[PDB]
Every structure is written in structure tokens, then in C-alpha cells.
Design a protein around this ligand. Structure first.
Ligand SMILES: O=C(O)c1cc(C(=O)O)c2c(n1)C(=O)C(=O)c1cc(C(=O)O)[nH]c1-2
Ligand SMILES: O=C(O)c1cc(C(=O)O)c2c(n1)C(=O)C(=O)c1cc(C(=O)O)[nH]c1-2
Ligand SMILES: [Ca+2]
Ligand SMILES: [Ca+2]
Lengths: 595, 73, 595, 73
């Protein structure tokens, strides 16, 4: 959307998930820089009134901040000049049964905004756990349209943030743990009319492939693979849902995103490459046709759901050619950089030297070289597999500094033991089939269960890490970088930290109410720069704390790995906004007072 | 199985030592019920039809009505 | 307790509800003063992980902060040098049925501390909504003893904070809305052994009266009134529970407190003065014998539960005599000052000129002169009665500045319509019998439903108000005063405010997550002064928001009066700690980091 | 009724105009069931006994046991 592109160039706004279409999470603002971060203090706060994980980040448009919550997914609009007054609030009435089919927490990644044209007003777009998608008038909060995208009766829910491109809203899907076959949909932003729907598995007609699909890299595979790399109808409950993030290049008109893991987790129950699950797609925004599709993890054996963040950049490759690229740190432990115009592999490096599941990724064949010792299979207990199913990188939305050409990534350092078991598929019931045990990786403390994360600065062309730093817990949530030489991120143990972009030195931190599983954002209001972040621990890592689970095996193996989380944080839900010296709307205490 | 021996482009799966190339009829046969398998397709079919009535009514009247049973004047 | 008395003189501690035995809520610390409050900023925060009202305030003892929550009443201990680490947490397993018999929110007023002797360790004492009382080892959190005080099966619960005097723990009671006859109990702090138990109604033997009860003011009434001012056995379900605050004078060995309202609310169903309900008592700490008892509201007709805060002072009366006094702003709209040695009435002034239920209080007879036009009765709808049942003052713990001899009180400006109805008494079921409609008082906005509170500076001898200021909502929660010429208080709309002690001018405010219904506290840690306050709106005023109620009549009439609350705040739960420039434990960001 | 006419010290209640001095037998008679009225007293009686067993056992053994059924070795 051209209006969104323009809006995204104002530092007074943060109009969409990821900031801009490049999905940079990078700000040119340098009011807050490494020389004065130490003066950063809260300016104001807001509780959402809900517990459970608070993922994503708020939107700021036209002097208003829009806040979203965990289930039942309420929306609040606050005026930046008097945040104390809630402009409007939307509180959805949803079927409580929706809760029973969420594999993970009752989380939601965010809102999207459409600027409006002449007849239709600006809109706030939101997904609900129960599978409905809704558009709300941005100034009044009234519901303009609402349509059903997913069905909880079959285990299909929504946690993903909508994405607005041109006059369309793209909606993903969730439910691979309940054997839901993945699909994404584009709706007309003004009426809710379905424009196109593409699946992750099955017949090419369902896959919605362009006539020239994988034309430049035919060895990635082309036609007939959605069924050909599966035995029988198994692709019908094949997984591949997309619940992560997108990126868009108006120049190619393609939306980039990854598809999730195949179902069930028991690999012995689904022989084959299980195609189009675990793949980086480039689909046309208007027709949904796939121009390219590169499968990262053929025949998944570890739940490395390939839904992670897509970050676009333009850098010169090793031959000096200036390429239009996409960088994507996957769950499987490999960061991929592909040419965003044709899907050509540029680099595929390890996130950490401790990986082990793959010896490497052959750039010519595009095939990852498996180490048979770390694969999973029926009647066998696999041990010390790195990364664990939680991956060396999960849902977190990272950032990229264009001046430095460095990616700042929130990494996980968790490995696992894994043994699968046979189970039937019953629509609406879980369809996992694996029992796991997770723990800190080789660089963490496996006895004390701490040292579960890392934060690193990476160059995609050289594959070099400028700096790496360990963290007590997994850096879920993501990162945000600024032209002030600062890298901001929230932690599971309850802090918002700021590190030196060049060295990784910790320069400042603030004890927020609960752990952060969303990413920081920034904006200016009336000349002052504010950094905001949600607090409210949860998601997969906080499932033990959130649901008061004790068996280390519960919560799909996450309970044991995060047994120490509760000694550092309790649940919460809200927003904390920071600024230098905590200057804000109430510097004149009379603002907001009853008279 | 190291993912390096491909039958065709993008088709490189090989069974693990001691495992069959086809699981149907084997001990690992999922024995999936076709009635269960088809449930998802039916749901999407029904939601898409429910949404069509909603959107056409919206376009015509200018007032969105999510309750399909309340649609058609 | 002598140890507590000494501990209470250290500015590094805040050892009991109300600060000290005088119940001053006054600090001599002046690091933060009117010349620099504007630099006050959060230093760190902590979410409790629960929603619902967060009443009371935290305790700070021996470099640790102890936090309490709403139901299920968890307790956390945090070390002040690294608040990020939860030292220990106690999470009670309670019967969910307890929730159904709480008239108001699932609130709790606080913890108490006993320094320990030689064999028994220091203890944290806490009440639970289910009626149990527990003592926990202050360093490990292990339960030392636990006894049952109240029975939910009969509608008896606990919301009151324990009070520690000498080697005893005094425990109140809750449940008058369910016809529970009030009683207070003293247990041996080391074993949980019941030392004494006194009732609010009934036979003198149950009342536990001293041989010289009301010796100086015999006209207050003496023997046989617990049954004599009731018709039949009606006193058996007569109310009089004490769920407010206490004060103690080691010099008289008396604990001062007030008893609640009589049951039912329908006055026509209980003819008589309904004695010992609504009365200011002075009971011996060791035997529990009542030395004096002054009934403020004979034959209650408005639910003016007489449980409010007791604040002790020594001032010269109008004749120049230096008196040992107690000042108590009641629900009925009158602030009472009595001689704390004999119970002699010194002053009984109106909280606001709009009172109307009583023309005045006759100091010689001690009888409040009723205005028959504002009384309630069967088959009649009373209108425009001020104060409403929520009173012109509720549960809030105020403060007193000794240097200025001024009380800083958080006041409510709410009036009501009232009509009673007949109903049977069934143990375990509510026994209210009145339908109410509440709204802003004459000085507020009755159309927009705002202007529900006030904050005033009062002199008990002269009866003069140095300054009065309106507030958007009722100033529930209380007040805290400092030698820095500042008066601190939290508001229902989500702020911690600081006013000039001499003029009432608003000097600073901070937007905290949710409204505050507890009182601010202060302490020093390593040379730096911190002000802490809970956030998490609820209690009676937030019952509509908390339970998503809509009928203005629901929540005992509070829903309609507070219909606008939701536009300014949502639920929450946690602690926000402030300090000048937000300096704190993490000023060296490396503190608390995994290594 | 203005609370100013006292029969005795601390006993100043007067019925309101049109209201009886005694409600028993009147239209406003609560008709309270004595079995209901006595329930509170019985509860307190039972809790006090349950606590006694807890405290005596605690004093004797040095280990607190809240579960009365688990008390007496
Ligand atoms: O297959 C699926 O559809 C699906 C959905 C989701 C989700 O909706 O949140 C997650 C996952 N998988 C998953 O594997 C997982 O890593 C995960 C973590 C989180 C989280 O919110 O922290 N969601 C999900
Ligand atoms: O009669 C009773 O026992 C009783 C108990 C309580 C309580 O336990 O919180 C309140 C009240 N009454 C009451 O009248 C009322 O004003 C009230 C307000 C609050 C609150 O927590 O905000 N509690 C109570
Ligand atoms: Ca998954
Ligand atoms: Ca009451």
C-alpha cells in the first residue's frame, strides 16, 4: 500500500508489524543514543487487564496508540496527549472452547492498519483466537466487517497478526499440532471479500503456483510435490500453517513468509519430503501465486516450524553484485539469505556452532546435509539434539541495521531428547505423537537450568558474527535497532535491555513488571522519542507458569526447560513507555485532571 | 538417510535403516479414517459460503450483518 | 511489641500496617521533598500475576520487601538489592467456594511481621479469604502454623490484615452482608494458640467487657446492651464484623478499632440501637477486655460500617490540656476525635458540609442528631441521602503530620437512593435486603458521573480544613505524608499523586498501570528513599469492572456510581517503586545478569 | 425518631411514625428460624476444637500438622 509506505517514513508513526515492508524494526531516530540511554525512564504505563502472554507490539498512527491483548483479544485506542483516557475499546465475545485448541498460550501477534480511501474510513485489522478476522473503524472502534477464517471445531485458530498490502489483508493460520493443513488468505480490506486462498500441501491447484514457479531454481522442485512427497491422502492433515511474519517488496509485488511444520510430529507416520511445509515462499500479493518456494527442512523430524521472521536488505554479495535479499533465521538452527527476486540461495549459516542436526546446507543442491545420529524415528529415543523443537530461533521479530549491514537476532540455546509414539487423528484433538525433554544447550548451565538464550550481531554475506552474548533465558520477543547505536530487546526474566550495536556491551536495563515476549517499538510524539514494550510473560516458554504445570514433559516439553522462570517473574499484561528522564504527557500534572 | 540421494528434484527422502518405503500395510500404518481426513475441507467450504452471504449483503445494504440467519431482510 | 516499636523507628523499614502503632503513615524522610518531587520516576516494578483489587501496601524489613495479593492470597519476598529474584513465594491452595461469599472484591489488606525471639524465627503473618490464618518463616516462607478463624460455609471470610502486638496476632472478621456476628481473636504468635475471642453483639460474657467498662462515660451505655438493644435472638446474626484497621498505645495497652454494620441492611427487620455494632472500642491487648466503647451510629439505616482507620496523636485541646487522642473519619460522614485513655468525646465534625443524614453530633449526650427526612425504612424509597453506603470515607488508611497537626484524608463524594425489602436469613446466603442507587454528591458532576472524591487537610481540635481538593473518583486507598512537605496517594483512575502539605497544590503525578486502592509507603535502602504503591483496581468501587456487571443496581449499587471507571483503567496487579531520577538496584546493568 | 429520646443510657431507639415498638407478630416479623440462627455458633465451636488438636499436637511434637485426621501419631 503506497499510503502505508509513505506513513512508514514518518518517525511519528509505527504503522504495521515490523515497522515497514522491509521488516527492519529499525529507527533512524537518535534522540536516545548510546551516550544517554542511562537516562531512560518510564514516562507512563497501561495495564491491559488480562494475564497470559502479550506478544507483538503496539501501533502508533495519527497521535494514537493501538493496543492488543491475549485472548479474548481486546483492542484499546489511547490518545498520546492524554494516555489516561481510553478513546475506545473493543472487547470480543468468543467461544471459550477456543482455549482448548491453542497448543501454546492464548497469544496474539498484533494489529495491522489500512489508511482508508475516500468512502471507507481508516481501519484497524485484527485476528481473534476463535478464527474470526475483523476490521474496526480506527477512530470509533465500531466493527465494519467480520468474517470466519478458521474453525476451532477442527483445531484451527488464529494467533498471527494481519498484514495489509495494497487494498488487501493477508491472514495466516495456526493448528499444525492438531493436524490442520496450512493455508493463507487475502481478503479485500473494504468488504471482507475473499480474494485468494492458497494451501501448503496437496494438489498444485490448491498450492496456487505461478506458471513460472521455481523457474530459476528448478532443482528446488516444481510441480506435483504437494502430493508426490506424501504417501496417500496424508497431506490432508499435513500441517504447514503460517503463524509467523511477512515482508513485502512493492518492486516484485511478492509477500515473503515461511510455512510451518508437517503433522504429526511422529516422522514415521508420514514418509516423504512432505512438501511445501517448512518452505520460504514468495507469493504475488494480488493473485497469491507462488513465484518461488524453497523447502528448508525436508521431512521434518524435530518440529522446526519454518514460520520465522523475514528481513529484507540490499547488499553486495561476494562477487560485488548488489542483490535484493531476504534474511531468515529458522528454527532448524540455520539462518538463510536468498535473492528475493528469484529465490536463489545466497548463504545458509549456522546460528550457533552447537547445531548438530545438519552437518551443513549444500548451496548448490539446496539440500541440508543431515547427521543421522540426531534424527528422530519410531521405537528410538533420540538424545542431545540441537536445536530443540523450540528451535535456536522462534517467533521473535528481529531487526537489521542498514548502515552497519548487521542483523540483531534474539536466539534460543535449548536442546532435547525425543521419542515418538503412534496415535490416531481425530479432528479437534491434538495430533502430536512425540514426548520431549528440553534443557539448556552446551553453552548454558544444564544443572541450574539457566543460560537458555543468546543475542548476536550477524552479517549475511560474510556469515560472521560481530558479537555474541549469552542471556539467562531464551530471547523470545525479538529485537529493535536504532540510528542511536542501540539494540533494544525484552527478556523473559522481566527486563527491557539496550546493548551497544558495535560491541554488544550491556548499557542499560529496566525491571518491567513481567517478562517480555513481544518486540520493542519507538516513535516521536511532539518532539520526544518514546520506546514502548509490552510486559506479560507467556507463549510457549511460559506455559508451565501460565498453566501451573509441573511435569517437565508437559507443555510439549517446555515445562522442564523453563522450570526456573517462576523465580524471576509472574504473569502480567500491559505496556510500559520510556523516554529520556521519563518526560511525557503528564509533565504538567494538571493534564488529565477532573475539573 | 542423509537427504542427499534424490529420486527427483525436491524429492530426496529415503527410509531409515530397517524402515519400509511405504508404511501402508506395515506395523507403522496410520490407518487414517477418510471421514476424519475430509472434515477440514468441509469446514472451509461452509465458512466460505457463510462469508459470501455476509459480504454480498454488506455490498448491497451498506450495513454488515455477521449473523447469517438475520440476512435476507 | 517492643522490638516492633524499635524497628518502626528505622527509616529502612516499614514493619506493620500503618507504619507504627500510632498508625501515622508519616515519614520523617525528606530526601524527596516539594522542591524535587518532579524528578520522581519508577526505579523498578513487579507484577503479582493476579488481577482483582490489590489493597494494603507492602512491608519492608531487613532489606526485603514482602508482597501480598488478592485471592488466592500469594506472598512473595524480594531482596532489595536484586528485586528481580523472587526469594520465596507462598501460594495457598484454597477452596474456590470462598469467592462466592465475598460481598465485595477478592481483596486483602496486608501482612504483619513478628521479629522472633530466640527459638522461634521472625514470622510473616497473613490472612486468607477462606478464613485461615497463617504464620510463615520470614526467611524461607515455610508455614510454621495455620489455624481456622472463619467459616465460609456460613459466609465468614477474611480480608483484614493481621496486627501484631507483644507476642500476639489480632485477627478481625468479615461477613456482615451475610449476617455474620462479628468477633476478633488474639492468637499466640508462636503456636497459633487462641488466647482470647470477643464478640460485637450478644451477652456481656461474649462481649468481654472490663469490670470498669465505660466508667468515665457511663452514658455511652454499659452492661446488657448487646442483647438489650435488640429484639429477641436477632443479635445472633447481628453483624458488627471488624475488617478495617487498628492502632495501639503501649501506654494504655489498648488496641483501638471500630466494629462494622449490623445485619440485615433492612433496618425495619432489627428494631433497637443494635449495640456494639458501629462502635469505637478500646480493648486490652492481653485479655481483650473492653475498657471503653462508643457507638457512633445507633440503629444503622445506611450501611455505614464503622470499621475505618484509627490515627493516634497528642495535641492540646481547646482548654490547653495536652490530650492523648485518636482521630477516626467514619463512613457516616463524621470524623471523631476521642480521648484515647477514657473514650471521652473531644470533637465530631462533618467530613463535608453536604452530609445531611445527621444534623450534628451532640458532644454531651454523645448522640448523633438524626434528620428524619434522610432515614431509611420499609415501604419507602429514600432519596438524596449523603453519604451513600460507600460512605464519605471507606477502608482507606490515611495519614497524620505531627509537625503540622493535620490529617490528610482520602474522601468519597457519593450519595444515594435506598429502598429496603424483606428477606429470610439462610446461613451461607447473602442477607442484605436493600436496593440502592448511588451517584456523585452535590459538588460532583451527576450527569457525567465524575467528581466522586476529595482529598482534605484537617485539624481535629479546631475542626478546620486547611485545604480541600476535588478528585475525579473516590480517593479509596488512603494517604501517606512525609517531612518533605508532600502528601502521597493513589487514585482509582491510575495515578500516584503528590500534593503540597500546606496548600494542596498538585505538584506531580505518574500514570501507573491500573487504579490504586492501597496506600503508598516509603523506606530507604542504601541511602536512597523509595516510595512504593500497588496498582490493581478493584474492591467495592471496581466490582462492576472486575466482574463485568452492567445493572447500575448490581454490586450493591456501586456499578451505577462507577460506570465511568472503565474509560480510565482496566484491572491489574503489581508494585511500582519510585525514587528520584529512578535510581535503583540496576543502575549497574550487570547486577542480576546470568553469568 | 431523632435519636435524642433515650429510655436508658445508650438505649435511644424509638420506632418511626406508623411503626410498632416490637415487630414480632407484626407484618415486618422476620420469622427467623432458630436452627438457622444457631449455625454460626456451631461452626466456631467446631473450628476451635479442630485448632486445639492442631496446637496441642504442635506443642508436643514440634511439627505442625493442619490435617486433624493425620493427628495422633
Ligand atoms: O503449528 C502451529 O500452527 C503453531 C502455532 C503456534 C501459534 O499459533 O502460536 C506456535 C507453534 N506452532 C509452534 O511450534 C511454536 O513454536 C510456538 C511458539 C509460540 C509462542 O506464541 O510463543 N507459538 C507457537
Ligand atoms: O460487613 C462486612 O463484613 C464487610 C466486609 C468488607 C470486606 O471484607 O472487604 C467490606 C465491607 N463490609 C463494606 O461495607 C465495604 O464497604 C467494603 C469495601 C471494601 C473494599 O475492599 O473496597 N470492603 C468492604
Ligand atoms: Ca507447531
Ligand atoms: Ca458491610
Amino acid at each position: 500500500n503506497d499510503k502505508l509506505v509513505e506513513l512508514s517514513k514518518s518517525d511519528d508513526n509505527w504503522v504495521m508489524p515490523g515497522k515497514n515492508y522491509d521488516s527492519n524494526n529499525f529507527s533512524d531516530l537518535k534522540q536516545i543514543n548510546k551516550g544517554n540511554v542511562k537516562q531512560l525512564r518510564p514516562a507512563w504505563t497501561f495495564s491491559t487487564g488480562l494475564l497470559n502472554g502479550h506478544e507483538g507490539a503496539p501501533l502508533v498512527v495519527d497521535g494514537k496508540m493501538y493496543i492488543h491483548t491475549s485472548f479474548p483479544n481486546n483492542t484499546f485506542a489511547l490518545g498520546l496527549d492524554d494516555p489516561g483516557t481510553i478513546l475506545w475499546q473493543d472487547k470480543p465475545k468468543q467461544n471459550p472452547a477456543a482455549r482448548a485448541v491453542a497448543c501454546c498460550d492464548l497469544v496474539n501477534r498484533g494489529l495491522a492498519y489500512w489508511p482508508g480511501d475516500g468512502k471507507t474510513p481508516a481501519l484497524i485489522l485484527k485476528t481473534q483466537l476463535d478464527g474470526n478476522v475483523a476490521a474496526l473503524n480506527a477512530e470509533t472502534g465500531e466493527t465494519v466487517w467480520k468474517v470466519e477464517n478458521s474453525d476451532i471445531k477442527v483445531g484451527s485458530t488464529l494467533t498471527i497478526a494481519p498484514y495489509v498490502v495494497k487494498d488487501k489483508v493477508i491472514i495466516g493460520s495456526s493448528g499444525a499440532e492438531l493436524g490442520v493443513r496450512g493455508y493463507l488468505t487475502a481478503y479485500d480490506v473494504k468488504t471482507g471479500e475473499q480474494v485468494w486462498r492458497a494451501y501448503a500441501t496437496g494438489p498444485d491447484k490448491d498450492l496456487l503456483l505461478a506458471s513460472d514457479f521455481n523457474i530459476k531454481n528448478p532443482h528446488y522442485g516444481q510441480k506435483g510435490l504437494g502430493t508426490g512427497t506424501w504417501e496417500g491422502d496424508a497431506w490432508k492433515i499435513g500441517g504447514g500453517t503460517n503463524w509467523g511474519w511477512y515482508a513485502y517488496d512493492p518492486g516484485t509485488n511478492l509477500i515473503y513468509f515461511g510455512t510451518g511444520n508437517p503433522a504429526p510430529w511422529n516422522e514415521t507416520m508420514r514418509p516423504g519430503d512432505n512438501k511445501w511445509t517448512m518452505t520460504i515462499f514468495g507469493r504475488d500479493a494480488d493473485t497469491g501465486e507462488a513465484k518461488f518456494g524453497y523447502q528448508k527442512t525436508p521431512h521434518d523430524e524435530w518440529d522446526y516450524a519454518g514460520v520465522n521472521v523475514m528481513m529484507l536488505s540490499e547488499q553486495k554479495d561476494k562477487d560485488g553484485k548488489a542483490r535484493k535479499l531476504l534474511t531468515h533465521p529458522d528454527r532448524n538452527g540455520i539462518v538463510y539469505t536468498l535473492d528475493r527476486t528469484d529465490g536463489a540461495l545466497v548463504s545458509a549459516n549456522k546460528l550457533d556452532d552447537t547445531v548438530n542436526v545438519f552437518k551443513s546446507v549444500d548451496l548448490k543442491t539446496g539440500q541440508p546435509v543431515r547427521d543421522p545420529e540426531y534424527g528422530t524415528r519410531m521405537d528410538h529415543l533420540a538424545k542431545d539434539i540441537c536445536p530443540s523443537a523450540m528451535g535456536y530461533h522462534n517467533q521473535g521479530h528481529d531487526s537489521y541495521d542498514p548502515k552497519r549491514e548487521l542483523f540483531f537476532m534474539g536466539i534460543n540455546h535449548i536442546c532435547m531428547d525425543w521419542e515418538p509414539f503412534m496415535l490416531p487423528y481425530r479432528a479437534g484433538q491434538f495430533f502430536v505423537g512425540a514426548t520431549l525433554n528440553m534443557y539448556p544447550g552446551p553453552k548454558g548451565d544444564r544443572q541450574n537450568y539457566e543460560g537458555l538464550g543468546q543475542i548476536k550481531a550477524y552479517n549475511a554475506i560474510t556469515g560472521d558474527y560481530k558479537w555474541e552474548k549469552m542471556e539467562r533465558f531464551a530471547v523470545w520477543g525479538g529485537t529493535m535497532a536504532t540510528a542511536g547505536d542501540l539494540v533494544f530487546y525484552g527478556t523473559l526474566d522481566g527486563y527491557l535491555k539496550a546493548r551497544d550495536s558495535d560491541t554488544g556491551d550491556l548499557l542499560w536495563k529496566f525491571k518491567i513488571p513481567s517478562g517480555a515476549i513481544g518486540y520493542p517499538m519507538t516513535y516521536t510524539h511532539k518532539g520526544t522519542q518514546y520506546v514502548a514494550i509490552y510486559y506479560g510473560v507467556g507463549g510457549w516458554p511460559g506455559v508451565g507458569l501460565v498453566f501451573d504445570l509441573a511435569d517437565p514433559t508437559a507443555g510439549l516439553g517446555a515445562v522442564g526447560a523453563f522450570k526456573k522462570l517462576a523465580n524471576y517473574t509472574q504473569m502480567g499484561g500491559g505496556v510500559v513507555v520510556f523516554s529520556l528522564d521519563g518526560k511525557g504527557p503528564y509533565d504538567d500534572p494538571n493534564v488529565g485532571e477532573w475539573k | 538417510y542423509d537427504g542427499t540421494k534424490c529420486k527427483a528434484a525436491g524429492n530426496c527422502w529415503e527410509p531409515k535403516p530397517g524402515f519400509p518405503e511405504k508404511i501402508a500395510g506395515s506395523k507403522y500404518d496410520p490407518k487414517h479414517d477418510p471421514k476424519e481426513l475430509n472434515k477440514q475441507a468441509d469446514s472451509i467450504k461452509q465458512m466460505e459460503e457463510r462469508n459470501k452471504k455476509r459480504v454480498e449483503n454488506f455490498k448491497k445494504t451498506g450495513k454488515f450483518e455477521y449473523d447469517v440467519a438475520k440476512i435476507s431482510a
